[PDB]
Design a protein around this nucleic acid. Structure first.
Ligand SMILES: [Mg+2]
Ligand SMILES: [Mg+2]
Ligand SMILES: [Mg+2]
Ligand SMILES: [Mg+2]
Ligand SMILES: [Mg+2]
Ligand SMILES: [Mg+2]
Ligand SMILES: [Mg+2]
Ligand SMILES: [Mg+2]
Ligand SMILES: [Mg+2]
Ligand SMILES: [Mg+2]
Ligand SMILES: [Mg+2]
Ligand SMILES: [Mg+2]
Ligand SMILES: [Mg+2]
Ligand SMILES: [Mg+2]
Ligand SMILES: [Mg+2]
Ligand SMILES: [Mg+2]
Ligand SMILES: [Mg+2]
Ligand SMILES: [Mg+2]
Ligand SMILES: [Mg+2]
Ligand SMILES: [Mg+2]
Ligand SMILES: [Mg+2]
Ligand SMILES: [Mg+2]
Ligand SMILES: [Mg+2]
Ligand SMILES: [Mg+2]
Ligand SMILES: [Mg+2]
Ligand SMILES: [Mg+2]
Ligand SMILES: [Mg+2]
Ligand SMILES: [Mg+2]
Ligand SMILES: [Mg+2]
Ligand SMILES: [Mg+2]
Ligand SMILES: [Mg+2]
Ligand SMILES: [Mg+2]
Ligand SMILES: [Mg+2]
Ligand SMILES: [Mg+2]
Ligand SMILES: [Mg+2]
Ligand SMILES: [Mg+2]
Ligand SMILES: [Mg+2]
Ligand SMILES: [Zn+2]
Lengths: 113, 112, 50, 46, 206, 65, 98, 156
RNA sequence: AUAUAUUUAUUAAUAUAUUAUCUAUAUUAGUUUAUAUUUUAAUUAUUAUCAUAGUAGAU
RNA sequence: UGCUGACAUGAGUAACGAAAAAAAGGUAUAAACCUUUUCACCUAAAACAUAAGGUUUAACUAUAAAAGUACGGCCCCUAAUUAAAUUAAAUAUAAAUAUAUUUAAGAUGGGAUAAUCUAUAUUAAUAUUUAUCUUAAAAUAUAUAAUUAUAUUAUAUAUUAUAUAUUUAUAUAAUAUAAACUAAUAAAGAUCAGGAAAAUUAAUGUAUACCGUAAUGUAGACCGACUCAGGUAUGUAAGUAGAGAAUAUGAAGGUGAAUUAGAUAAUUAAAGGGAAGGAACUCGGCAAAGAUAGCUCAUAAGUUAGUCAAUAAAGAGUAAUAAGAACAAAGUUGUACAACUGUUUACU
């Protein structure tokens, strides 16, 4: 513990002026540096393509199809099994993938809703 | 330490309401405010007039809001891209509806 | 809502129990529904099962 | 020495001791499970 | 054993000249978790670099994790000489220090605040730090060229990250230099084969 | 106050509605120890290495033709 | 210390001051005096120091002259053990020290 | 000759040049996939060169990439995966508690940028108009949680 | 150093106001300290806080 | 002392759970929410990283981003141990089952490569515990090759200058603080004698899967019925001081709270001081008071010879003479019982 009797410690052993090495780095940062306001990134530099494949998840580039934009229930019908039965394999496969695409579009929208 | 009996209706009521100490008193010491002719307490400032003066002071002695240049001159689309919206929590929503839990000062009656 | 319930079928048994309420406690179930709904929405006729 | 905090959770231990598969694996545990099923229990094990 | 690597110390121009691991350039790294930026003399970095930069951390500007996945290269800036690159790096570090410790109130005033007076955030991601780093980079470069052949260039991760080529980045000094604002080629996994891409870039300008 | 609209002590919790509940409910990926690995039926793809790595087996990888 | 007061142990300077040959040592599995039930059958046995049982040749079959290379401390027996080395064969083995 | 990461990068570049897959296609041919993906709006932490999806919980990172390539024609260069936690929910305190679903969300990095179309005004779109359902919810809350003399209290 | 005024032939000199006394590199891994280098990076008057009212003498 | 429900009484009584707050403004809505400034409290923590746990409580639904190198799981490997498993006839057994052996599981442990970045696949072929002393070496000064006194003494890197392969490589020389601390090295003292388990060349490969990642974690987010002065694992833990992680302060960071404002009777608690006296108190000096160095000296009778007694009591040096931070340090003896360090009625 520190006490009335504690004599102060000696100063650290400095290396002489002649013996000390010169530092490897001499010239440091500029003193003139100034805190400028930030520069927020802009959409102007982008060139988002009109046929970017992620537009395929939308429908007519709409954030959401309105009631009028949607196909009405009376006009639309699902496929009949008999109708499907006389379609080729490749055609059926294409139809399936179109269906899946449509679901994805709706799923995105449905989730948002 | 413990009550020996169910205290009766009479004895609890005469205890509570019988003494004048325990009763509420009429506030006889109301009087007219000179700035607006309304009720106020005696030897007290009118809370309307002092509030108005405080409001005036605020409007005049107003520290200007810091609007950063770069955010003030953003495009709308660019701003939307950078700083999109979010769902606030239930707690946050509750905090936002201040009128639910925060009492604004009522005006007194006009003196005759 | 902020739900995520719609992308799954979680707590399935509980949902079944709620969905298939016994018919003798149907008045109990619908009393509170009626209360909840505004006048312009609510209907007098009984919502029959599928 | 204050009591009350005799439960000291540790998921792994719980699953070893009171988990469904532990019950299934033992004969006694299987009997318990059956008994719970008969009763009508929604939750047979941890 | 050999403890120190190239990254383990600050390396001056003379050291770079002796070695020639990379050309004269400085690397800049976004933090995907918090939005904080990390400058470095090399395409890799260690905890030491993080400690050096993130000296006064708080709830708003937390000391970032050293986990490799959340760090991603914002910008690779090439210069005319090793010494020049070193000077730029020093300037950036100085600017960071000023923003965190010395001239912190001014920096705070400059930033975007939300309602309830906090520096705008989404989660713990704060998009002001990146912006500041771009502004700070611009400042440091400008100072270097004031202090002051290969045409210098700044290979960007993303062209969007520029504030505006008219409002900023069109100083007379930069124009005189021929400061080409290129971008890194994204014909591959940019995050995963990042180091390879950086090596390829380094090779290109030598 | 935890929430400024509730000045006085109602029996409301610090978070949520009830502390108690059915503990016996299946584990998820988030729960358990460091060693607890649930998995999500996503990767019976390749093979685990002797050293702890992983080696994809492309004949057992899902393409969508 | 008062615990030291009555601590006597016989000094054997010729005794080996190194580890035993690792090929001739198996782990000495502790039991706490518990049998296959898991119940304490033998009382008063418990957590000692860790040990290795040493595989010492009681049968003494091979034959031929063998030189005692060293004599060791063995933690699982009161006797010392002697590391023999077969002169012809070169095979190494432990034996109760005479 | 060259290291592994470099080889991978070279392969990816070659695939890009081809207009073939920028990745080794698997052998487990799924002709009729039933998986759907939900394209999400971008967070502040992401760039215009990223897109995030809700995907199947049993969807692989490689699988997702394959799906994006073949179904849509988009090539995701880098993919991350964020399996979310399932917080406990219950209809009321009388019911049993259970977790909401753990939901998998995969960010992708892509070589061309993309920004969403701007969300519609209240007057424009019928569905995207949160006033009505929120009002209805509020009314329900009022009516069920109305007790005594708050029945007389006028509606909000 | 910046900002505002005055002189001088934007520059320097003066006056007032505000802010600053940091930083970076060397000495064989790390930390601290020391010195050197780097930088404009100051030493006197007078206060305050904390240490049982910090302790003590009076009051 | 019936059961269930409802509602009284005590009573608008106690209490509101260790706590430092003030103003201005958000807002002519705020003791309680947010901001700014001031003030305070924690600071080998009330900080910063984490483990376990949990109603996701988070800076939130537009949500916690990994091929691997001071990244974990998963995987390989096994310990303790576990297994309606394993072997005309493994052995035993009223049934259940139990035993032995195999195999399989089983982390709290072991596991290749890596910034000059690194490549894990397939096929073929033959380490208890503690210690770093003394000597010796050379270096720096005094005195007259040798003596005396003092530090230094295995490793960790940049610079400069040489010699060989050809500005990239290898080796040599010289230049360069103190005090802690790390890892890796070497040599080695003690008895209590110190885990288990999973090959190498060559050719051909490698498009790098899944899960964890928020915040909270000496706590309002876990275990204690409560936002409970309890319980809860690990690592950093600014400097100044010191033998030190003691003690004081507190740079930074975090915090100032589901109670406030006043008044401060009697009385209680937790503190501070006290004339003259000094155990007269009391079952009993219970409680309180009492420390004239903590470093360096010095230190008795007895005694089982162990500075056991001893940290002896007293006492000295340094410091201080009117005193003037905290913390460590609180007498001497006789007898009964028990050798001693230990263990015991978790809650008398
Ligand atoms: Mg209990
Ligand atoms: Mg157990
Ligand atoms: Mg990587
Ligand atoms: Mg319970
Ligand atoms: Mg967990
Ligand atoms: Mg891994
Ligand atoms: Mg015995
Ligand atoms: Mg992951
Ligand atoms: Mg060093
Ligand atoms: Mg100065
Ligand atoms: Mg303090
Ligand atoms: Mg009765
Ligand atoms: Mg009373
Ligand atoms: Mg009272
Ligand atoms: Mg009271
Ligand atoms: Mg106010
Ligand atoms: Mg302490
Ligand atoms: Mg923390
Ligand atoms: Mg195994
Ligand atoms: Mg382990
Ligand atoms: Mg965590
Ligand atoms: Mg974290
Ligand atoms: Mg709890
Ligand atoms: Mg209790
Ligand atoms: Mg507590
Ligand atoms: Mg300290
Ligand atoms: Mg402070
Ligand atoms: Mg905290
Ligand atoms: Mg309190
Ligand atoms: Mg007295
Ligand atoms: Mg006196
Ligand atoms: Mg008496
Ligand atoms: Mg006492
Ligand atoms: Mg004597
Ligand atoms: Mg003491
Ligand atoms: Mg005794
Ligand atoms: Mg007791
Ligand atoms: Zn008035």
């Amino acid at each position: 513990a520190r006490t009335k009797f504690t004599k102060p410690k000696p100063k650290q052993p400095v290396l002489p002026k002649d013996k000390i090495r010169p530092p490897t780095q001499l010239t440091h940062h500029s003193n003139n540096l100034r805190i400028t306001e930030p520069i927020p990134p802009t959409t102007s530099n982008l060139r988002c393509p009109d046929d970017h494949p992620l537009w395929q998840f939308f429908s007519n580039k709409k954030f959401i199809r309105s009631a009028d934009d949607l196909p009405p229930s009376s006009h639309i019908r699902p496929w009949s099994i008999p109708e499907l039965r006389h379609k080729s394999f490749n055609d059926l496969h294409s139809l399936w993938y179109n269906c899946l695409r449509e679901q994805n579009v709706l799923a995105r929208e449905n989730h948002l809703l | 330490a413990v009550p020996k009996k169910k205290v009766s209706h009479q004895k609890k009521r005469q205890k509570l309401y019988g003494p004048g100490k325990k009763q509420l008193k009429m506030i006889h010491h109301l009087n007219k405010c000179p700035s607006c002719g309304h009720y106020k307490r005696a030897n007290t400032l009118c809370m309307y007039c002092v509030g108005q003066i405080s409001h005036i002071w605020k409007t005049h002695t107003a520290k200007e809001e810091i609007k950063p240049r770069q955010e003030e001159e953003l495009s709308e689309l660019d701003q939307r891209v950078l700083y999109p919206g979010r769902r606030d929590t239930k707690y946050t929503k509750d905090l936002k509806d201040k009128d639910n839990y925060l009492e604004r000062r009522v005006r007194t009656l006009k003196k005759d | 809502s902020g739900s995520y319930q719609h992308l799954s079928n979680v707590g399935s048994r509980v949902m079944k129990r709620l969905g298939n309420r016994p018919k003798n406690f149907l008045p109990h179930s619908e009393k509170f529904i009626k209360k909840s709904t505004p006048e312009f929405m609510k209907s007098d006729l009984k919502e029959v099962d599928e | 020495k204050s009591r009350g905090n005799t439960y000291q959770p540790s998921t792994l231990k719980r699953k070893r001791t009171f988990g469904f598969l532990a019950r299934a694996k033992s004969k006694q545990g299987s009997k318990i499970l059956k008994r719970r099923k008969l009763k009508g229990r929604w939750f047979l094990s941890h | 054993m050999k403890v120190n690597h190239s990254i383990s110390r600050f390396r001056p121009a003379s050291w770079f000249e002796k070695t020639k691991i990379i050309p004269p350039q400085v690397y800049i790294f976004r933090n995907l978790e918090y939005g904080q930026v990390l400058y470095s003399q090399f395409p890799n970095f260690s905890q030491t670099q993080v400690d050096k930069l993130f000296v006064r951390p708080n709830w708003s500007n937390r000391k970032p994790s050293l986990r490799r996945d959340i760090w991603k290269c914002m910008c690779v800036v090439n210069l005319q000489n090793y010494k020049q690159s070193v000077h730029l790096y020093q300037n950036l570090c100085r600017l960071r220090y000023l923003r965190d410790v010395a001239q912190r109130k001014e920096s705070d005033k400059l930033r975007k605040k939300d309602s309830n007076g906090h520096v705008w955030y989404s989660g713990q991601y704060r998009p002001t730090y990146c912006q500041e780093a771009v502004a700070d980079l611009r400042e440091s470069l400008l100072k270097v060229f004031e202090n002051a052949a290969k045409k210098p260039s700044i290979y960007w991760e993303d062209p969007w990250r520029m504030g505006d080529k008219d409002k900023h980045w069109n100083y007379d000094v930069f124009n005189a230099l021929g400061l080409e604002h290129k971008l890194i080629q994204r014909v591959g996994n940019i995050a995963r084969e990042e180091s390879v891409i950086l090596k390829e870039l380094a090779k290109l300008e030598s | 106050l935890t929430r400024p609209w509730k000045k006085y002590r109602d029996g409301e919790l610090f978070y949520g509605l009830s502390k108690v509940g059915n503990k016996r409910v299946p584990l998820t990926t988030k729960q358990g120890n460091k060693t607890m690995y649930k998995g999500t039926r996503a990767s019976g793809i390749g093979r685990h290495t002797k050293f702890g790595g992983y080696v994809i087996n492309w004949k057992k990888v899902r393409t969508y033709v | 210390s008062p615990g030291l007061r009555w601590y006597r142990s016989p000094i054997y300077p010729y005794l080996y001051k190194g580890r035993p040959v690792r090929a001739l040592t198996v782990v000495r599995k502790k039991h706490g005096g518990r049998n296959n039930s898991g119940k304490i059958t033998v009382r008063h046995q418990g957590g000692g120091h860790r040990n290795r049982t040493r595989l010492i040749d009681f049968n003494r079959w091979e034959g031929g002259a063998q030189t005692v290379q060293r004599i060791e401390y063995d933690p699982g027996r009161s006797s010392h053990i002697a590391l023999l080395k077969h002169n012809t064969t070169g095979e190494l083995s432990y034996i109760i020290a005479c | 000759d060259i290291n592994v990461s470099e080889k991978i990068y070279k392969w990816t570049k070659a695939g890009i040049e081809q207009g073939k897959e920028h990745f080794k296609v698997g052998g487990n041919k799924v002709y009729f996939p039933k998986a759907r993906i939900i394209l999400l709006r971008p967070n502040a932490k992401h760039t215009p060169y990223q897109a995030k999806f809700i995907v199947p919980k049993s969807f692989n990172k490689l699988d997702l990439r394959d799906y994006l390539y073949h179904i849509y024609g988009l090539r995701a260069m880098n993919i991350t995966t964020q399996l979310l936690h399932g917080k406990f929910n219950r209809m009321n305190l009388q019911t049993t508690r259970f977790r909401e679903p753990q939901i998998k969300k995969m960010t992708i990095e892509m070589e061309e940028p993309f920004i969403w179309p701007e969300e519609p005004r209240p007057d424009e779109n019928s569905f995207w108009d949160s006033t009505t359902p929120d009002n209805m919810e509020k009314y329900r809350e009022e009516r069920l949680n109305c007790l005594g003399s708050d029945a007389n209290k006028p509606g909000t």
